Ligand binder design. Sequence first.
Ligand code: NA
Length: 129
Amino acid sequence: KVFGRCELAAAMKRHGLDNYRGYSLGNWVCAAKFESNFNTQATNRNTDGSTDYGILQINSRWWCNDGRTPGSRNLCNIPCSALLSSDITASVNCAKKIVSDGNGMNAWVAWRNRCKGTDVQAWIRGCRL
Ligand code: NA
């Protein structure tokens, strides 16, 4: 599913991401935009052989099991395919584990390079939330 910007904001809010560990909703929307262009089916392979999955591009080296990333962990205890669902619950629940891991949203390289230190509230302006 390709979300609309406000539709995704609402979904994320309902799943407890607004201000989760102090990151306002626009941060999450901004990271999704640049990670996946709001497409839950996005996948991208990394140079190390791991793959990033879903709307928040969660990596198989640490967070999910895809059966093809040797020596990896599965810290969210989920098949990576669950991250591609139109239902974002598994991506959000896993993102909450990731953002709590020490480095905050800096875990998402696109957040650090494209969202951090920008007016992220712009991403939810105009939405009914
Ligand atoms: Na893995």
